[PDB]
Design a protein around this ligand. Structure first.
Ligand code: T7O
Ligand code: CL
Length: 242
């Protein structure tokens, strides 16, 4: 069911880094990774948590739809794209933490915890502050657990409405051309060691879907572009994308 392909380690060592890529071939129900142990090691989800957070906020009515505007609070932060109004689409695209912190406050601890259990999401543990637990609280998830969750989302099998899942999958749209569609979400965890980057999502082809989840050590923000670049080199090597 899971097979290790250590040839992919070259894509990490080429960049003097370390990490794991996990792929899942949906038609064949077969998984692949360069590192079985790290594929099952759990880390802070950081901004990959915007996927479950979006789903919960929509299903509870905290977010009406993907057009509702969440006004900038006027506090200047160091990420320029955060100092502006957002909707769900752009808040996902620019990983706008303060928007999702307000979602979380309105969801509240009780509803957040029971929905993460309903989702079977990671260790289902929201200990810490309700508006930051995915950045520095007790929640943890592994790359293989991200795949499990994403497959449910793809198939509309999570315990929220079909509408909520369709909207979040729209908001995950990252790249599309004549050859493939990628729906995905980045993450960057810095508040507890080891600092890591995430990229989780899937690749839609004409006649198959490949789910993926990767994380990698990220000692500085200068390497963030490697999250997508390394994943895409693996996809290219496996002839999943040109
Ligand atoms: C985790 C942490 O220290 O968050 C603070 C911080 C520092 C540097 C960059 C970013 C950031 C902002 C927007 C998008 C992305 C991305 O990679 O999509 C990254 C966030
Ligand atoms: Cl779409």
């Amino acid at each position: 069911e899971w097979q290790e392909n250590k040839s992919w380690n070259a894509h990490f060592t080429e960049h003097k880094s370390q990490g794991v890529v996990v792929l899942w071939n949906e038609n064949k129900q077969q998984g692949f990774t360069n590192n079985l142990k790290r594929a099952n090691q759990a880390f802070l989800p950081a901004s990959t948590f915007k996927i479950p957070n979006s789903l919960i906020a929509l299903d509870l009515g905290v977010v009406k739809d993907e057009h509702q505007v969440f006004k900038w609070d006027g506090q200047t932060r160091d990420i320029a794209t955060w100092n502006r109004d957002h909707n769900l689409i752009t808040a996902m695209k620019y990983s706008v933490v303060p928007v999702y912190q307000e979602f979380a406050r309105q969801i509240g601890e009780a509803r957040m915890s029971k929905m993460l259990h309903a989702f079977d999401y990671g260790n289902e543990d929201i200990s810490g502050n309700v508006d930051s637990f995915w950045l520095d609280g007790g929640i943890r998830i592994s790359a293989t657990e991200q795949i499990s969750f994403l497959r449910k989302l793809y198939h509309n099998k999570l315990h929220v409405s079909e509408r909520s899942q369709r909207i979040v999958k729209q908001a995950m749209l990252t790249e599309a051309n004549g050859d493939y569609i990628i729906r995905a979400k980045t993450g960057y965890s810095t508040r507890i060691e080891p600092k890591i980057g995430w990229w989780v999502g899937w690749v839609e082809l004409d006649d198959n879907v490949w789910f993926f989840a990767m994380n990698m050590d990220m000692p500085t923000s200068d390497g963030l572009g490697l999250r997508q670049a390394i994943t895409k080199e693996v996809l290219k090597q496996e002839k999943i994308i040109p």
